[PDB]
Design an enzyme around this catalytic site. Structure first.
Site, PDB file in Angstrom:
ATOM      1  N   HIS A  41       5.163  -3.022  -2.854  1.00  0.00           N
ATOM      2  CA  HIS A  41       5.178  -1.912  -1.876  1.00  0.00           C
ATOM      3  C   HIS A  41       6.233  -2.712  -0.866  1.00  0.00           C
ATOM      4  O   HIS A  41       6.725  -2.023  -0.321  1.00  0.00           O
ATOM      5  CB  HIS A  41       4.133  -1.445  -1.213  1.00  0.00           C
ATOM      6  CG  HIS A  41       2.965  -2.109  -0.534  1.00  0.00           C
ATOM      7  ND1 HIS A  41       3.353  -3.047   0.661  1.00  0.00           N
ATOM      8  CD2 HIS A  41       1.911  -2.267  -0.456  1.00  0.00           C
ATOM      9  CE1 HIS A  41       2.354  -3.411   1.207  1.00  0.00           C
ATOM     10  NE2 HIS A  41       1.133  -3.198   0.508  1.00  0.00           N
ATOM     11  N   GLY A 143       1.257  -6.116   8.569  1.00  0.00           N
ATOM     12  CA  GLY A 143       2.020  -7.486   8.224  1.00  0.00           C
ATOM     13  C   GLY A 143       1.446  -8.267   7.455  1.00  0.00           C
ATOM     14  O   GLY A 143       1.992  -9.240   6.881  1.00  0.00           O
ATOM     15  N   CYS A 145       0.099  -7.814   4.491  1.00  0.00           N
ATOM     16  CA  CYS A 145      -0.155  -7.553   3.259  1.00  0.00           C
ATOM     17  C   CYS A 145       0.599  -8.799   2.298  1.00  0.00           C
ATOM     18  O   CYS A 145       1.656  -9.555   2.752  1.00  0.00           O
ATOM     19  CB  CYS A 145       0.648  -6.350   2.765  1.00  0.00           C
ATOM     20  SG  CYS A 145      -0.147  -4.808   3.296  1.00  0.00           S
TER      21      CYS A 145
END
Ligand code: A1A3O
Ligand code: A1A3O
Lengths: 302, 302
Positions: A41, A143, A145
């Site tokens: 992503h 932030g 991930c």
């Protein structure tokens, strides 16, 4: 003595964390040998995030669209590929701090340590379990991930979790390091909900053994139960069924304490039916289910 | 979102841990620059441990009586000295992994991370507070002496705790890194007891703000209290008095949530008088006091 929520020392994983930026989108990656692993992503923007076609999104990228930073060093990307829900970025330099590692998928009920990172920089370490419903009750902000979950055995880091998203209830969802989700979740910003969860019975029993090892005995009683009569009560209170395999796994703790597993089950039955009456066990006023039998043996013998 | 007991990443401290052996006695040390710091009780045996004269014990040692191992490398000791309850062993090699560091003594009510070690090898990381009575509720087994406690700010490790012993209640006692005990404790195996403890009120309020930030609101009410009328109830329940300085420190969280400190104090008053009625806050069925306002801001904004 004492019993704490304890994580593995995070150094070996700290030396693998990098920042990955694609456009305006920045997150964390894991740099092992000459590959960086991150959530795919990263190739979305807020325009795409609702229902991305990742195959089309990635075809439209080149190596130079990915900026990888290991501290102040930029690592040049020399290849890219998708691996389920993970992106693999081949870089021109192998990480000199790569530990011995493996990628393992864990089961519901098992625990791991999380190194929470922001901008490629490690911020904190905590321990958690994989819930029965395949979520984790983590602590993650915008932030985070690409932060990973792991266990360490000897010198070897077994990576088990990469963080992808937060569900509406505030719990967390992610993948193994091959990019396959834990649970019935997808990497899009949509209407996803965690399913019904259960309490991990074998871990509650392990923690009651930890409590006895540490001198909390008040909940002990002279009774025993059968496994079947215990599981009858378990079902009523939304606890997982206890198997003979679970009984066997608790063997070491039952031997250390002298309290048979089905004797401890009679204590648990009583606590579920009656409550604690204002008392505490290991500093808690509820029954804790995020310590495995292995976790207990680790702190309560070495 | 989410709120966990979170430690600092331990890597910078892992690269400083060594094993120190004097005779049959082995424990951990902290290797910074060309000095190794460890509990002076390494120079005792079970024969001495009851009431050692450490000055006599150390005069009778030489450099070669101390075996320091950093992994498989033995570090040669080239000098030795006592620093209150810490021993300083000068070694022939400066640690190449020495972080930026300082030695800071912490206050009761403040938190830190512990890297628990055995035989010089890091085993686990956890977070804890310095209690009002100068003990810590840690998790430490035989062999863990010389394990350290720390906080990290930016790149700099502030070491605050070195572990020395376990008290009869199962809580832990130690020194700052200048060798001065926290609390009225001595490094001998004797009849020492932790004094009466109190609950750290400012931290309970901080954690209630964390709970609101994470969507737990059930304990909120329309009331307010004065500081004096709050402290009246605090005293009854064995809570520390809340100062105006504490009110000021909670400013940021009160602004983020829109709930005045003395409005939150009325919630806490109600919880102390009435209990939770079977409900939970942030996964706990009791009031948690080991998160500082800074700890809360760290997880509940970044
Ligand atoms: O980092 C967080 C995050 C926010 C709040 C709490 N958290 C706790 N753990 C992580 C968080 N994200 C960013 C990524 N998100 C996505 C999730 C699935 C698919 C795509 C995206 C996505 C991709 C590009 C831009 C955007 N975007 O601009 O939103 C979103 C989830 C939210
Ligand atoms: O490591 C543990 C320890 C055991 C159990 C639970 N723990 C949780 N944290 C740490 C532990 N020690 C060893 C050191 N002890 C001492 C404490 C004060 C002064 C001297 C000594 C001493 C020195 C030489 C030999 C011996 N000795 O042979 O006992 C004891 C305390 C106990």
């Amino acid at each position: 003595s004492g019993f704490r929520k304890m994580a593995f020392p995070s150094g070996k994983v700290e030396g693998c964390m990098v920042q990955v930026t694609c456009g305006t989108t920045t997150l964390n990656g894991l740099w092992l040998d000459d590959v960086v692993y991150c959530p795919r992503h990263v190739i979305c923007t807020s325009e795409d995030m609702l229902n991305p076609n990742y195959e089309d999104l990635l075809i439209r990228k080149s190596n130079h669209n990915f900026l990888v930073q290991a501290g102040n060093v930029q690592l040049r990307v020399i290849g890219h590929s998708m691996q389920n829900c993970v992106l693999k970025l081949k870089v021109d330099t192998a990480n000199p701090k790569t530990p011995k590692y493996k990628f393992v998928r864990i089961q519901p009920g098992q625990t791991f340590s999380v190194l929470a990172c922001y901008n490629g920089s490690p911020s904190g370490v905590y321990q958690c379990a994989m819930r029965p419903n395949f979520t984790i009750k983590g602590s993650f902000l915008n932030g985070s991930c690409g932060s990973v979950g792991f266990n360490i055995d000897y010198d070897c880091v077994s990576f088990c979790y990469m963080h992808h998203m937060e569900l509406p209830t505030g719990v967390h969802a992610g993948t193994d390091l091959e990019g396959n989700f834990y649970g019935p979740f997808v990497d899009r910003q949509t209407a996803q909900a965690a399913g019904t969860d259960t309490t991990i019975t074998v871990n509650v029993l392990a923690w009651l053994y930890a409590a006895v090892i540490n001198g909390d005995r008040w909940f002990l009683n002279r009774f025993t139960t059968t496994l079947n009569d215990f599981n009858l009560v378990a079902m009523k209170y939304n606890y997982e069924p206890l198997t003979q395999d679970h009984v066997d796994i608790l063997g070491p703790l039952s031997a250390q304490t002298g309290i048979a597993v089905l004797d401890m089950c009679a204590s648990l039955k009583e606590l579920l039916q009656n409550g604690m009456n204002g008392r505490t066990i290991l500093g808690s006023a509820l029954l804790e289910d995020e310590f495995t039998p292995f976790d207990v043996v680790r702190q309560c013998s070495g």
